[PDB]
Amino acid sequence: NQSVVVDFLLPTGVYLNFPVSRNANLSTIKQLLWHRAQYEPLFHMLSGPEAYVFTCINQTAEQQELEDEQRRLCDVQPFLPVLRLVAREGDRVKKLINSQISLLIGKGLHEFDSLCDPEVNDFRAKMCQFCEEAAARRQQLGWEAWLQYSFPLQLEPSLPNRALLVNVKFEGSEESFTFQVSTKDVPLALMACALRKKATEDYTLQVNGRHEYLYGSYPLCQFQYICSCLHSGLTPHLTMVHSSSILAMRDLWSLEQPFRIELIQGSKVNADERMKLVVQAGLFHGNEMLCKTVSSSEVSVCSEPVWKQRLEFDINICDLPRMARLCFALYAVIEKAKADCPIAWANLMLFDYKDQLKTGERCLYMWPSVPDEKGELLNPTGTVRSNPNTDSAAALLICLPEVAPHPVYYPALEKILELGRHTEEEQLQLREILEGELYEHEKDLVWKLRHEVQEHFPEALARLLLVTKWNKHEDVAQMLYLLCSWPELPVLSALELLDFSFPDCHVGSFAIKSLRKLTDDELFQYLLQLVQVLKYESYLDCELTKFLLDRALANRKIGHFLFWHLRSEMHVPSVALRFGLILEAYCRGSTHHMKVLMKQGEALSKLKALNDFVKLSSQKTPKPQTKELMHLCMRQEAYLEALSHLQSPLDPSTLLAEVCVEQCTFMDSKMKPLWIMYSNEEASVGIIFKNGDDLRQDMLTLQMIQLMDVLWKQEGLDLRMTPYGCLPTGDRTGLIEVVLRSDTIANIQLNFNKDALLNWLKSKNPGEALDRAIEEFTLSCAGYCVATYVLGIGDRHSDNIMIRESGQLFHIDFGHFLGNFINRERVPFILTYDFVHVIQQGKTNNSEKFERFRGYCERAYTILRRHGLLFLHLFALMRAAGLPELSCSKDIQYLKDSLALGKTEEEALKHFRVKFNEALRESWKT
Ligand SMILES: CC(=O)N1CCN(c2cccc(-c3cc(-c4ccnn4CC(F)(F)F)c4c(N)ncnn34)c2)C(=O)C1(C)C
Numbered sequence: 038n039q040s041v042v043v044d045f046l047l048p049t050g051v052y053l054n055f056p057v058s059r060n061a062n063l064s065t066i067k068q069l070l071w072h073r074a075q076y077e078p079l080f081h082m083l084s085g086p087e088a089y090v091f092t093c094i095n096q097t098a099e100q101q102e103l104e105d106e107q108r109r110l111c112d113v114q115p116f117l118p119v120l121r122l123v124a125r126e127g128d129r130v131k132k133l134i135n136s137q138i139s140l141l142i143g144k145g146l147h148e149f150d151s152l153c154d155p156e157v158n159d160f161r162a163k164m165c166q167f168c169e170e171a172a173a174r175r176q177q178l179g180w181e182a183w184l185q186y187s188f189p190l191q192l193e194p195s196l197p198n199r200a201l202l203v204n205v206k207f208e209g210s211e212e213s214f215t216f217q218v219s220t221k222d223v224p225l226a227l228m229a230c231a232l233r234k235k236a237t238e239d240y241t242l243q244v245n246g247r248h249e250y251l252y253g254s255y256p257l258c259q260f261q262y263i264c265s266c267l268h269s270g271l272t273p274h275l276t277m278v279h280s281s282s283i284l285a286m287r288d289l290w291s292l293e294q295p296f297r298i299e300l301i302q303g304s305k306v307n308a309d310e311r312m313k314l315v316v317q318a319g320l321f322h323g324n325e326m327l328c329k330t331v332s333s334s335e336v337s338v339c340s341e342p343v344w345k346q347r348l349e350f351d352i353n354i355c356d357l358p359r360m361a362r363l364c365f366a367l368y369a370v371i372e373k374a375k376a377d378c379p380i381a382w383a384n385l386m387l388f389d390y391k392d393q394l395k396t397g398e399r400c401l402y403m404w405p406s407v408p409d410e411k412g413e414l415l416n417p418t419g420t421v422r423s424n425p426n427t428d429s430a431a432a433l434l435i436c437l438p439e440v441a442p443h444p445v446y447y448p449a450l451e452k453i454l455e456l457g458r459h460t461e462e463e464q465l466q467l468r469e470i471l472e473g474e475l476y477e478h479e480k481d482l483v484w485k486l487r488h489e490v491q492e493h494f495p496e497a498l499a500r501l502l503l504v505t506k507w508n509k510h511e512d513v514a515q516m517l518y519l520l521c522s523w524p525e526l527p528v529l530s531a532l533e534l535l536d537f538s539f540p541d542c543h544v545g546s547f548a549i550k551s552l553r554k555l556t557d558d559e560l561f562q563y564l565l566q567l568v569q570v571l572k573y574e575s576y577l578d579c580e581l582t583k584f585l586l587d588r589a590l591a592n593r594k595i596g597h598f599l600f601w602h603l604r605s606e607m608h609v610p611s612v613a614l615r616f617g618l619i620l621e622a623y624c625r626g627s628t629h630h631m632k633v634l635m636k637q638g639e640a641l642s643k644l645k646a647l648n649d650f651v652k653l654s655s656q657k658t659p660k661p662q663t664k665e666l667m668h669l670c671m672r673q674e675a676y677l678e679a680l681s682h683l684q685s686p687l688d689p690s691t692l693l694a695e696v697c698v699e700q701c702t703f704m705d706s707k708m709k710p711l712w713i714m715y716s717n718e719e720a721s722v723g724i725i726f727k728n729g730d731d732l733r734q735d736m737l738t739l740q741m742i743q744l745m746d747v748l749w750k751q752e753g754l755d756l757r758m759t760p761y762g763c764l765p766t767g768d769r770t771g772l773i774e775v776v777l778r779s780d781t782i783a784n785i786q787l788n789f790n791k792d793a794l795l796n797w798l799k800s801k802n803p804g805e806a807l808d809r810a811i812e813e814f815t816l817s818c819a820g821y822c823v824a825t826y827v828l829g830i831g832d833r834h835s836d837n838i839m840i841r842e843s844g845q846l847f848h849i850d851f852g853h854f855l856g857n858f859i860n861r862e863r864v865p866f867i868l869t870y871d872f873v874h875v876i877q878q879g880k881t882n883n884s885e886k887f888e889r890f891r892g893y894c895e896r897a898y899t900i901l902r903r904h905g906l907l908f909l910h911l912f913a914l915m916r917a918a919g920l921p922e923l924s925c926s927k928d929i930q931y932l933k934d935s936l937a938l939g940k941t942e943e944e945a946l947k948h949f950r951v952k953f954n955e956a957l958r959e960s961w962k963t
Contacts, residue, residue, distance in 0.1 A: 041110070045070055046121040048089070049079040057110065060674055063091055064106035066120070089122040097145035101136045104129060109675050112639075134628065141635055142620045143607045149618065156390045160577040160618050164586065168626025171590040180283040184241060187286070187593045187629070188250045188690065189557060191261045194750040196221075201257070201267065204274040205231040206245070208282060215272070221256040231277065241283075242275040246720025248690040251275065269843075290448065290510070292354035292440050296320065296387075298363065300333050301398070302434035303342040308369040308380060312338045315368045316433065320350055320387075321417040322361055322507040323540040328352040330414060335370060354394075354440065358507045359447045360540040360575060361387040364415040365433055366406060379406030381431050382416045383423070390576040392446040398436040402427050404611075410925070418537055420611045421575055450521070456511070457518025464489065471497045480504040484512075487519065495524045499533050502544060517543055526551045532563070532910040535581070537573040537917070542580070549580040557592045562744055564595065565737065566914040568602040571619075572612060573917055582619060590626045597689045599623065600634055605765040636683045641766055643679045644711060644726040647671065652709045660705070668698050680713070687724065687762035687774050694718045712775070723775030732771035734920055736763045738851040741908070742824050748904050749820070749897055756820030756897060757813050759847035778842035781849070782871070783835035794840065795875055801842040813844025815876050815886070819893035821848055822866065826952075827901055827935045829856040831864040846872070855931040857922050863934070866949075868956040870963060891953065898949050905938045 039060065045053040055073055057066050067086050074080055091103040093115035102123070103113060110118075139145045149157055175186060198220045205214035205227075214231050224242060232240075242251035244262050257263045266273045300316055308314060313335035320327040328351040336342045363385045369378035381403035388394050402423040406416065424430045467486050470479045471494050483490060483504040490501045501519075506512040520543050526534075531551035534544055555563075571581060589596035600623060603616040624631050650670060654663040671677060677696065685691035693715045700714035700723075708729030715722045743760040762774040778801075786793045802810040825833055830851050837850045856862050876890050877883040901908075912929050922928065932938070937945035 041118050043110075043118040043120060045074075046119070047074065047077075047079075047083065048122050048124075049082050051077055051079050053077055059111045060109050062107055062109050063103055063113065066110065067091070067106065088125065090125045092121040092123045093119060095136070095140065095145075097139045097143070097147075099136075099139060099145045099147050101139075102129070102132045104133055111675055112679070134625070134631075137631060137635060138621050138624045141624065141631065141638060142604070142617055144613065144617045146621065149614075149621075156577055157614070157618065159390075161621070163578065164582070164618070164622035165625045167583070168586060168590060168622045171587075172626040172628065175590070176287075180280050180287070183287045184250055184252065184283055186591070188248055189592050189594050190253055190255070191249055191690065192255060192259050192558075193261055193264050194747050195259055199267065201263075202272050203227060204272050205234075205242075206274065206276045207235070208276065208278060213274075218257065220258045220267070223254065223256065224252050227251070227257060227275070228277070240277045240279045243278050244720075245274040245276055246692055246694070246717045248684065248692065250278075289445070289452070290355045292445070294354060294440070296350040296352045296354055296357060297438055298348045298350075299436040299438065300344045300346050300348055300433070301436055302344065303367065304340070304400075304432040304434065305429065306338070306340055306342060306367070306380065306431050308338045308378070310338045311371075312369040312378070313372045314338055314342050314380075315370045316344065317366045317368060317414045318348055319364050319415045319417070320352055320357075320361060321364055321415075322358050323538045324417060325507060325538075326417075327357070327361060327508045335372060338369065352508055356508055356510050357387055357394075358510070358513050359388060359392070359542060362417065362421060362540075362575070363387055364417050364419070365401065365403070365435075366415050367403065367431070367433065368414075379408060382406050382419055383433060384417065384419050384421045385435075386421050386575050387437075388447055390578065394440075394445050394447070395437050396439045396444070398434065400432055400434050402430050402432045404430075418573075420572070422611065422614060425610050425613060453514050453517050454521060457514040457516075467494070471500060475500065475504060487515070491519050491523060496526065496530055498523060498526065498530070498547075499539070502534075502539060502541070507541075517541075520544070520547060523547065528552060528555060528559070529906060529910065532566075532907075532914070535567070535570045535573075536913055540573075540575065542575075546580050549584045552584065557588070557595060560588060561595060561598070562740075562747065563911065564598055565602060565740055566911050568599070569917040570914050571615060574615070577615060577618060586619065586622055586626075589623055593627075593630060594689060596623060596627055596630055597634070600630070601686060601764055601766060604638075605767055605771070608768040633684050633689065637686045638766075639679045640683055641686070641726075641770070643676055644713070645728055645767075645770065647676070648703075648709065648711050648726055648728050651703050651711065655703075655709055660703075664702055667703070668701065671696070671698050671701065685722070685724065686766060687764050687772050691722060692717075692720075693722060693724065710773070714775075721777060723777065725773040725775060726770075727773060728770045731769055732763060732765045732773075733918060734854070734922065735773075735851055736765060736771075737915060737918075737920070737923075738828060738830065738854055739763050741828060741911075742821075742848075744908075744911075745824055745827075745897075745901060746820070749900055752900055754893070754896060754900065755816070756893065757816040757845050758820050759817070759841065759845055761847070776839070776841060776847070779839050779847075781836055782838045782840055785840060786835060786871075791871075791874060792879065794871060795879055797840070798844060798875065802844065810844030811875060811878055814840075814846055814872070815890050816893060817844070817846040818872050818876065819890060819897055821846055822868070823894055823897040823901065824848075826864065826866045827898070827932070828854050829861075829864045829931050829935060830854045831856070831858050833867055853922060855922055855928050861927075861931070865959075866952045866956040868953075868960040870960045873957070873960055894953060895946065895949065899942070899946065902936050902938070902942065902945060905932075905936045908932055908936070909938070 039058050040056045041059050042054060042056050047053065053070065053073055057069060071086050074083065093101055093103060093113065095101045096114055096116065098116070135146055149161065200217060201220060202215055202217045205216055214234055216231050216234055218227050225238070227242060228240065243249070249262055251260055258267065263273050298318065303314065306314065315335055316333040317330060318332070319330040331348045331350055333344050333346055336344060366382045367380040369380055383401040383403040385399065385401060404419065404424050463482060463486060466482055467489060470483060475483065483501060487501060490497050502516065505516045528551065531548045534548035567581065567585060574581065585599060589599040600620065603620050606612050606616055647667065647670060651663055651667055654666055658666065671680065680696050681694070683693050685693050695716045695718065697714040697716050702712040704710045704712060708727055710725050710727035713724045713726060742758065746756065746758045746760060749756055759776055761776050763771060765771040782794065785797045798810050799807060825848060832852065833848070837848060839847050839849050841847065856864055877886055909929060909932055912923065912932055915923050937948055940948065
């Protein structure tokens with residue numbers, strides 16, 4: 038039951054075994070131990086209880102020094118119930134941090150040591166040091182840099198002046214100061230005035246019961262809080278927190294012989310014995326084939342097949358680029374006389390992380406080949422890391438041969454740039470071409486006029502890199518010479534060069550260099566794509582990893598979402614290692630945030646266990662019984678402590694304080710998502726814990742709508758959208774924000790009947806408020822009509838459309854996008870009669886209003902077109918995520934067509950109009 042028998046190992050070699058409760062804190066267990074130890078031999082020899090610390094083997098299989106004795110044995114969760122006393126003394130900082138990391142990332146650091154891979158070890162040393170340094174450096178600076186680091190300003194994208202009554206306050210003081218000020222007032226104006234208002238450049242304003250601070254050179258109206266307060270009517274309640282209170286928070290070449298590879302053996306193969314096994318091999322540079330694909334002989338199907346066969350390639354060693362990858366696929370072929378069975382695949386870098394060409398034997402633990410649309414012999418886009426299941430997985434034994442008495446490395450930049458140095462008819466023939474897939478005759482024209490491309494077409498660098506023959510080192514040196522003198526490209530062009538088709542490390546270096554102009558705000562908008570692109574990297578230490586880490590240590594919000602982006606994929610074998618090494622480095626440099634993410638991951642662990650119970654208890658007792666059988670399981674000391682007082686993983690500046698267990702429920706949906714409510718100690722907020730469904734798809738959809746909202750908001754168009762948070766936290770687990778005062782159009786319609794929504798809106802907006810809500814409906818309708826049409830999100834019914842008490846419409850449960858319904862087809866613009874009605878304020882005909890709504894739809898679509906390449910570039914990088922709905926060229930193509938990307942602005946607007954008008958015509962029929 039509650040109690041558990043614990044083994045205790047005393048430093049005298051004495052052994053005690055007695056029962057204790059699973060909820061007992063370690064401090065309490067130590068006392069029961071000293072009480073029983075006095076009646077066991079060699080007690081006199083022991084030092085005081087406080088002289089010792091408990092040691093245990095945690096879930097992640099490593100020894101853990103259990104320093105915080107306020108932890109319950111249940112929260113410690115040791116492998117077997119074994120505790121060992123050890124002398125406290127040593128570096129009880131690295132011992133403490135290393136342990137917390139292993140728990141937090143859900144992988145023991147020992148797994149990294151076990152590998153005996155220097156690449157892993159060098160990454161760890163360099164990255165942990167860079168981070169540790171940046172953290173130490175962070176600690177040096179004063180309150181202004183720190184408040185900028187931990188609580189970065191949450192501002193509106195960006196106008197009149199208005200009267201604003203603002204309720205000021207002070208630290209500890211329960212005495213308010215309702216002082217009114219100008220909409221365009223700087224922070225000091227709202228500050229020192231209230232300091233002068235109390236008496237008759239120190240401190241900053243803080244939003245009550247939030248980690249949101251008002252500071253810096255900006256007008257009040259430009260701050261999300263003030264801004265939302267103005268719109269929702271409500272008066273902003275600030276607090277003056279002194280500098281003292283903030284500080285308290287603060288504390289050579291030659292080899293002209295061919296490329297040779299010795300396919301020695303295969304291992305643990307699981308194929309039909311009737312068949313024959315073949316190993317197909319190719320050489321690649323990104324997506325491009327570096328030469329013809331050599332194949333092995335057929336050998337009979339067995340577990341350990343032997344080939345001991347030499348494979349030569351139509352590429353001479355000195356021609357192999359830095360990023361050359363050897364790709365393998367094992368096939369089960371029906372011996373020569375209807376489909377060739379793809380067994381497994383494996384990719385390998387021809388050069389190591391230190392520029393040295395790999396020699397000797399290699400045992401490549403292989404990944405299963407997934408049967409798909411692109412049959413493809415090989416998988417060059419696949420990961421270069423070995424299948425971590427070295428245990429039960431198939432493998433291939435290869436041997437790259439020695440080719441010199443001394444090891445050979447790829448040339449240095451100086452020896453590359455050395456070799457690299459050095460008409461009006463064709464000048465037109467370059468303009469016509471540079472105005473995606475260039476034809477081989479056009480390719481050579483671009484390469485010949487490559488200096489003309491650098492001089493007059495710098496934005497066509499991507500086009501130039503793809504025409505380059507990466508299988509001829511002469512051609513590579515030439516390109517690289519121009520690269521090292523190329524003008525800095527805009528963020529938009531740089532985003533394109535992050536994709537798998539640009540594997541050269543010099544390319545990646547240029548791409549990051551141009552991405553260094555990004556404000557924390559715009560960076561946050563691409564963060565998900567940038568994390569995804571790490572899956573296309575060849576080596577652990579790369580420019581993108583370093584960039585992503587620099588940014589995360591410079592901004593806390595970025596660091597937080599970078600943590601969850603990597604954390605939520607710690608289950609995927611392909612990324613576990615890479616992501617794990619980034620998370621350790623991030624943690625080492627963000628020890629403060631480590632404490633927050635620890636609290637969050639803990640509550641998350643409880644919710645998975647709580648949800649798991651409810652899921653089961655649904656297939657037993659009825660819903661109100663389960664509800665009450667959930668409230669007792671929640672009110673357990675440990676459950677309630679873990680679920681209380683934490684920063685929200687969805688928005689770390691939101692303080693989820695006291696759980697309202699009475700208000701906590703679950704949803705009658707498939708995966709039974711938990712409805713968890715909280716109340717404000719100083720400032721309501723709720724979270725939805727869903728486990729079972731993949732949330733990546735929904736987060737990308739929501740991120741894009743938010744991007745659209747920012748792009749629209751930037752050009753003075755506020756379409757009153759609801760960018761509710763959705764965050765994947767783990768394996769088929771995530772959180773979804775609670776939008777209070779909202780209901781699904783199906784539920785609203787069942788409580789005239791054509792006026793069912795208008796009555797609901799009337800019952801939530803009386804008199805003067807009715808006209809406000811319809812403008813909220815009109816504005817949100819347009820935005821979501823345009824959004825869902827552009828993204829190809831179909832199946833838009835009343836169970837997946839929601840209305841807010843303010844009048845704002847918004848979409849939920851985006852199951853599929855890009856025309857997919859399983860089967861991708863062009864989703865038309867959809868005008869719903871029910872909505873068209875509310876827009877017309879109840880009338881049959883009201884073009885006065887309806888045409889204004891037409892304008893919102895039309896300008897929303899027009900703005901999206903202006904940023905069409907952004908969405909294509911972003912979506913093209915998302916192909917690294919491996920979502921079925923976003924796996925190829927035709928998925929990204931959807932966007933080109935939806936946004937009429939090809940067609941002129943006028944040609945696009947007239948087709949949008951035709952589609953709009955027919956959505957209104959077909960609206961009537963439904
Ligand atoms: C108080 C209470 O116990 N309620 C009332 C809310 N409710 C309900 C109904 C219809 C839609 C949504 C719903 C779905 C989503 C939603 C948005 C995106 N995905 N989802 C569903 C998901 F959370 F499961 F993912 C959201 C949301 N973000 N905020 C508020 N309600 N809400 C909730 C309920 O079933 C119960 C559980 C009966």
